[PDB]
């Protein structure tokens, strides 16, 4: 229905200790398997104009760092916490996925948090290697990653081509290859509402770990040009079948280069998209733009309403708008005192599981726990509504970097002074 603007997801795939032992430490076979399923995933997202470029692989070999359990929710929360604590601090990426051989309860094969694409604690994925063929594997890879983009399980009467679609959830005798018409609108609504700015920029060609393949609309290091399928390449400067530059041309795909010739040094190629998104200028001898950078974290943003944190300006008002309604507002200071109780919903940190010692928040840290938002649209009771569910507990907690008080922001669930 629409040609969506071209977005690149940076993915990191982690293999569990159970999975690596199934292949008897044959890392080459695992790498080939991952590359094949990711090629299939890139093939199936072609109509969405979304590319999944693998950035790095993590091998938990001869050890494990999280308590992987048969319960999907527990291990999913544990992996999400571990990811947001270690992987983002160690490796820049957009999405993370765990590959495990441990069977899960109720025969569940994959699970992930919806709408969590750019979220630190909530962009995480769990998949079980249940198939001997890569096609059925990429089926549920695509299903879960589509969940993470805000697309839900397919509702009746949304069948595509008289065949079950990818968002069906339940198994089908032939594995399908296309999303339903009731998914394009959901993706568009997610883009309009949650505004996932973290997947707009393409990754550097030098950072890609996946081997180069011609025709996937991704420019890897080993190839001089990559425009996509030969039947789609409208750029005269390259031919996809040859996968080489047209004679007389100096560029293929890119942002800094324009009009099929390298632009002069000092010309802007990555414009400022936000208050703390400082622009970058071309190096003058490369078609790729320099790595995206932002202003120092801690600068005021959005009319002094918040502080920037890694290129984003988080405020409790925007989170309330996202959670409940376009007219939501942060609740009164009285309701944030409920986090002192350590109740089943009000807490700061808790042990992994349905049960767990939910630690009560500190008296000054009450505003870094749950987020309470006033909304009189649904019902006038519960003046301080909150969103909480055992599947996606982290949703509804204030994002790191939000302004708890003047001169202080919530870092690691604690209201601490800015520019310490």
């Amino acid at each position, epitope marked *: 229905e629409r040609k969506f603007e071209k977005k690149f997801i940076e993915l990191v795939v982690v293999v569990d200790h159970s999975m690596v032992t199934k292949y008897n430490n044959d890392s080459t076979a695992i790498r080939t398997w991952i590359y094949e399923m990711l090629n299939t995933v890139n093939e199936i997202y072609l109509p969405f104009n979304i590319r999944v470029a693998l950035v790095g692989l993590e091998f938990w070999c001869n050890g494990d760092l999280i308590n992987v359990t048969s319960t999907a929710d527990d291990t999913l929360h544990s992996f999400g916490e571990w990811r947001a604590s270690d992987l983002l601090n160690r490796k820049r990426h957009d999405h993370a996925q765990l590959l495990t051989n441990v069977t899960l309860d109720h025969s569940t094969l994959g699970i992930t948090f919806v709408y969590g694409m750019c979220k630190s604690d909530r962009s995480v994925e769990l998949i079980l290697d249940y198939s001997n063929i890569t096609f059925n594997m990429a089926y549920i890879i695509a299903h879960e990653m589509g969940h993470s983009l805000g697309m839900l399980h397919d509702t009746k009467f949304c069948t595509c081509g008289a065949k079950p679609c990818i968002m069906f959830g339940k198994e089908s005798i032939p594995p399908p290859k296309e999303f339903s018409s009731c998914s394009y609108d959901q993706y568009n609504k997610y883009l309009l509402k949650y505004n996932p700015k973290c997947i707009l920029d393409p990754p550097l060609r030098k950072d890609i770990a996946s081997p180069a393949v011609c025709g996937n609309e991704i420019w890897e290091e080993g190839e001089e040009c990559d425009c996509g399928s030969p039947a789609d390449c409208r750029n005269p400067c390259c031919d996809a079948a040859t996968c080489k530059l047209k004679p007389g041309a100096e560029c293929g795909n890119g942002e800094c280069c324009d009009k099929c010739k390298i632009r002069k040094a000092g010309t802007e190629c990555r414009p400022a998209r936000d208050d703390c998104d400082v622009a970058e200028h071309c190096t003058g001898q490369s078609a790729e733009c320099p790595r995206n950078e932002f202003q120092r974290n801690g600068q005021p943003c959005l009319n002094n309403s918040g502080y920037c944190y890694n290129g984003d300006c988080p405020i409790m008002l925007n989170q309330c708008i996202a959670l409940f309604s376009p007219s939501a507002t942060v609740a*009164q*200071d*009285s*309701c944030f*005192q*409920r986090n*002192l*109780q350590g*109740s089943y919903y009000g807490y700061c940190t808790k042990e992994i599981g349905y049960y767990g010692k939910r630690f009560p928040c500190a008296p000054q840290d009450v505003k870094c726990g749950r987020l309470y938002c006033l909304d009189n649209s649904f019902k*006038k*009771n*519960m*003046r301080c509504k909150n969103d909480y569910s055992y599947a996606d507990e982290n949703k509804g907690i204030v994002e790191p970097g939000t302004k708890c008080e003047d001169g202080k922001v919530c870092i690691n669930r604690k209201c601490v002074d800015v520019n310490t």
Partner: antibody
Amino acid sequence: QVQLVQSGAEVKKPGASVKVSCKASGYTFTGYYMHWVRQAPGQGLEWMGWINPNSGGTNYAQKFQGRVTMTRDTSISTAYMELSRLRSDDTAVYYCAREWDDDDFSFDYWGQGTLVTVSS
Amino acid sequence: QSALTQPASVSGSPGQSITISCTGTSSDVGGYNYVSWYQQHPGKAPKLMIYEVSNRPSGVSNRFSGSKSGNTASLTISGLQAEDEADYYCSSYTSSSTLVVFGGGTKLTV
């Protein structure tokens, strides 16, 4: 569990003022509005305004706007209600009804009730 | 007394079922459908049975059910026992100076 305990019964001649206290324990006192309910013997329940234990802001019913003043003590976790210029109609028992999580217009936990009587 | 109107008294038998009516104007009960019911034993503080017309807090028997029809909200009890010899009060949210108003109460004899 949530527990509410109030002061002993008082006898006041007409024209005086009465101050009752309600002690809250087992929960964060500042997080929940503290309503007051007044019941004459043999009659129905009457409502009195709520006090916000965090900010101290108070609302009063139209029947009591000129009579009641409500005060809090966060460091002790007690609420106070003052009723001045008592009249013989004000023979009743008083409960410090609390709100709760799923509804703000309903009261789950009530104090044991203190009885105030006014006569010659 | 208060604005909400309830029947003066009602009686039943342990092997029977009963209904208690609560009524008010459009602003009192009919409009905002936030009615809740209370039960009070002699000498004890009132206890909450149902809220939001039909919703019911945990820790009480299933014999207490609530429903709304126009301006009138009704409470029905089936299988009377010794616990039901108490007073029942109706309360509703009002869009006026008074935030919430209670009922006149009724006496139930088993």
